[model samples]
Target: RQVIGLDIGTTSTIAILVRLPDTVVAVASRPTTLSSPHPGWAEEDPAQWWDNARAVLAELKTTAGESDWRPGGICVTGMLPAVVLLDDRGAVLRPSIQQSDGRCGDEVAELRAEVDSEAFLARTGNGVTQQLVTAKLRWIERHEPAVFGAIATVCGSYDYINMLLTGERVVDRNWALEGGFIDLASGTVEADLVALAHIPPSAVPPAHPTHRVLGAVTAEAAALTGLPTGLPVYGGAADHIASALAAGITRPGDVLLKFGGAGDIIVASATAKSDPRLYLDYHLVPGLYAPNGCMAATGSALNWLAKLLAPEAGEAAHAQLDALAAEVPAGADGLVCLPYFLGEKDPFASGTFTGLSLSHTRGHLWRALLEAVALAFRHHVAVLDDIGHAPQRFFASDGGTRSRVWMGIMADVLQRPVQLLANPLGSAVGAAWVAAIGGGDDLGWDDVTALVRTGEKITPDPAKAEVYDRLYRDFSALYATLHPFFHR
Candidate 1:
């Protein structure tokens, strides 16, 4: 029997089918549509996610049939800290608020006043942010009382699918950890905190550690997706968890280097940290946590430059720009880009390009953008260092890691060798590995880590280290110099 993995992403739902001994047989993906009724609000319909998953699974079923694959089990992972509200009958009350949504600042302020930041992080392993479920639920209750009144259960993407598959609302432990709704020490919902957050305790699903079997797939889900009935569905994890594990980041101090969209500098830690400035969430397993920093606008800033200056490059803009950026010397010819295009925890939070001159060209702009992103990464690395220990290696994932030129830039800027993940199926492969384990493989994380395939390494060039080192100082000073203006 073969195992299947499902990755419910913010932009797409990907399905992976893997045979025994780490052989990947099939991979399929479908896009997810995000609906925004107002500015700063991002919503994804759970129904649409189901449709996307069904499409991917339908393709997988055909592939499985041709390859003579028998169904073993399923594991799901997805973009998280997402909130999906459901009625008692398991009907979605409204579209889920995705990770990028930022419509709950007032609610977040209220939450801060009601709960101390330190106490909150101590209880839930997270801080009170508009991006978190606590603030979002509060927003719904205060803004759209009807929606809040109707909701009976709150879950992540996989939880909805799990309900559809096995009629189980077993929540992923990692989600609940970052979710700010559960007591990690007790493996139960935090009733006091939930009540304080203006949410009903019953609405939250019972949490379970990742990789445990929740239940078997139901006949209805089998009919819809052509999956075998009674296929075991394991308690899944968040997308970052799966990707990190897939990239052999199971050990303490292992990191997943993501430099796209919002920068995710994921570090595997032996201790569950509680820092308002850094993201500290429980690991899929106990006795560990995912301590990382998220840099807003790190990828978005790059995209903005591509559209503005490299329009002629079209779809090949990044490659074209990156090619030119490689020719530009380190320090980007004395140009620096502070790519804080979105709001951040940092005091100074706006995007800017500093020290541009007539000597600069599109190549200079491109190099500066790369440097900006890499500089942002350095900030995150510092946060990791402060939290505990620094990562020994970075297992790179995400679309932003595609550019070799940018990868080289990152390697030099951070003074760390970059190990490009050989496979694009990061979360899918991870979830599938977990499925294989759950389906009686008796595989530990070490065994799965051994199965991960790695690619070429990009080491920093010592000759260019001085330039990066000097610019890193300027990068650190940008916030102090620009915070007042950003506040204005």
Candidate 2:
């Protein structure tokens, strides 16, 4: 038996086919551009996502042979903190709102004031942010009340896609928790938070475990994707959980470092302990929790620097820029970048950048940006350490990890040996694993362990780690010192 995992990402959607024992074969990937017509806004058409998803599956069917692919289950995972308004018929009411939509700036502050931050965190294991569903719903009610009222149900990216496949309005607990809806204690929606958003309880969908069967794929969906009808659809997880599962982070003291367009540093824990300052979400798998501290801009910062310094490098600039960034020594010649060009902060703080110098070269600035982001990870790691559950092994993923220099920098900065997995599919691969497990396949952590073997381990350089540690302290201090400036 096999399982198919579909991941709807910020910039693209990927589908992967994983055979039960332990093998992941790539299916297809369809690029979908994020619509950012306005500053601080990112949107994608749900219909476009569906179309692209179908196209990718069709491509996979041709390559992997429809006869060879006998799917026992299907799973869906995607970007978190995105809200999708679904009509009565399960069609999207509007374009799927991306997490970058900052129109809820005021609502986020209002929520923080209305509810005690610590109390809220303790309940949901998540910090209040404009990207969260509650804040975005408040924005919709205030500005687009008509659309808000028309909603038969509200779903996240994966939930909406799952509805299309199963004709059921259901969400997994892990995805709902990130939306600030799940109650940590009871594993149900928090009534008070829903009331705060002025949304009816009916707006929320029934939550299930990540491995629960959502339903079988409808005939309509099967025809569109060229898959066999009546295949089971499992409740997959959010990207973070899927990534953790893919990295064999089932046990505590495991960490997954994702250096995507944005940087996310997450560590697994046996229990859910809330910190008001950190972003925490329920683990896709039961009995685990994932909390992350994000660097608002990581790869995007490097891309911006590439355009500024080498405008002609175009799409292939990452390799050239990585080479350039590697030339600079650690500490980036006393330069420190704040890395908040996106104007939103992770860990419930405001955003800012500081410590610029006129004498800094492109290499210094670029490397400083990378180091600054790594320092942000260090800050979060310190928080995790204080709260308990410091990760022993750090597994790296995403396109940013493709840069060996940056990987080495991260390892040196974190002072931990970073392991790279042979399967770079990350979340999608894990989603398929979850689906296989839900299908009653005996693929546990040991099976997943053997599947994702190590590619290279980047061990830390003690001398460089010390230097980066000092730089990280200074980098974090800059954010605290400049918080008032951004607020004003």
Candidate 3:
């Protein structure tokens, strides 16, 4: 018996085929097109996600043969804090508003002003933020009442897709914990929470634990991808939670460093830890939670630097740029960067350069960019340290680990070694594992941990750690001093 995994990402949908218990056999993905009716607003048709998932799986099924994808069970994972509007029978009523939307700022403002924010944070484990869907739900109710009237069931992206495939209208606990609606401590919706947002309790989707089988694939879905009917479909998780599970995080003190994208420092807590600066969310495993924060633009900053350094190199440019960056000395020979290229989220910050001179080359700038990412990560890690117990060791995953230069730099920057996943697609692996558990197999985090064959542990060089310490102070202060300029 095998397990199949589906993950609906912001940019694409991925279908994966894995052998029972652990080994990945084949993986396929398709790009998701985001429709922007208004600037700063992000949306997509849920039907298209189904289209891509079907195509990706159909292709994999054809190539790997039906035995590979006709698995013991299927699990879904997707990007969330996204809103999906659905009518009865789980039909998508509107293009889902996802994280890319900023139109709901006014609604976010209302929530912050009308509510007892400290008490609100006390209830939900975090403060009001624009990325969350609570305000968006309010936005639709106020500005588009007719559309809101049509919404009988509301859910996150994964929940919508899961309903389409499995005919089980369900949401996972992780996505449910966000958006200022549910009492995360209880996994139960506080009616006033939704009522305050101007949404009815009837619109809320039922919550399900992430590991159990919720329903099975229906005949119509089987026609969509050639999957056998009655294939068990389990409750799914948000992408980061799935990725955390794939990274073998189970204990109170495990740290998973995502050195790219928003650049997370995710720490597992035996109990929920709240900070105004970091996020708190549900863990895939019971009685656990993830306390985390981000860099706003770690990988994007590096990609921006790469194109400036070698625009014509195409897909191979990063390899060349990283190789160039590896040649530079620690601290980039008096050059340093502030990597908030698209601005920032933590207390609001700006991007700038402090130590540029005629002595600096493109390689120096590249190295500085890489170091800037690590410097921001240090702050996130510091928050993790203060709030959570000491980690057993750092586990680094994400696309960032592909660059040895970045991995080596992180080891020294944190003054700790990093353990890399043998395969970087941690979320996909966890999706597969969720399917295994959904199928009633004897699979635990340790069972999955046995499958996480690690790549080499990148160790720190004492000398570089000392050098970064000096620049680290300036890096920390640069944003505090320069942020006003970026803001005003």
Give lDDT tens digits, candidate 1, residues 1-488. Answer: 48888999988899988877667778899988888999988999999889998899889878767557686988888888889988877788888999889799998888888778888787677777886788898888888899998888888888788789898777887777777877656756778767866777877878887767889889999999888889888887788877777777777887778766777787888866667677776555446677877777766777888999887778888888888888888888788778877766555577788898988999999898788888878777777778775667776767777888888888888788888765567688778877777777466765555446676688999877888988988877876788788889
Give the distance in Å from residue 292's predicted Cα in candidate 3 to where it truly belongs: 2.4
lDDT by residue (332-381, candidate 3, tens digit) is 98776788767665555656777888888778888898888887777777
lDDT of 2 by residue, 1-488 (tens): 78888998888899988776767655688888888777877888888778888888777777788667777788888887678997667667888788867667888988889888778778888878776788888888888898888887888888878888888778778667778887888888877767777888888888877867788889999999887789898885788777777877777888878787787777888857878656777666667787776766778877777788778987777677678788888998888777777754443343343556787777776688778778777777787888876668688877777789888988999999998765566578778887777777465753665557667888999988678878887887787777776567
- Evaluate candidate 3 by giving its C-alpha RMSD to the native, one decimal: 2.6
Reference-based lDDT, each prediction? 0.80, 0.78, 0.79
The better-scoring model by lDDT among 2 and 3 is 3
Candidate 3 minimal-lDDT segment of 10 residues? 342-351
Comparing 1 with 2 on TM-score, the higher-scoring candidate is: 1
Q: How many pairs of residues in model 1 come into backbone collision?
A: 0
Which regions of candidate 2 deviate over 4 angstroms?
36-39, 88-91, 307-329, 332-337, 343-366, 422-426, 449-453, 477-488
**In candidate 1, where is summed lDDT lowest over 10 consecutive residues?**
444-453
User: Which residue pairs collide in model 3, if any?
Assistant: none
Q: List the candidates' TM-scores in order.
A: 0.91, 0.87, 0.91
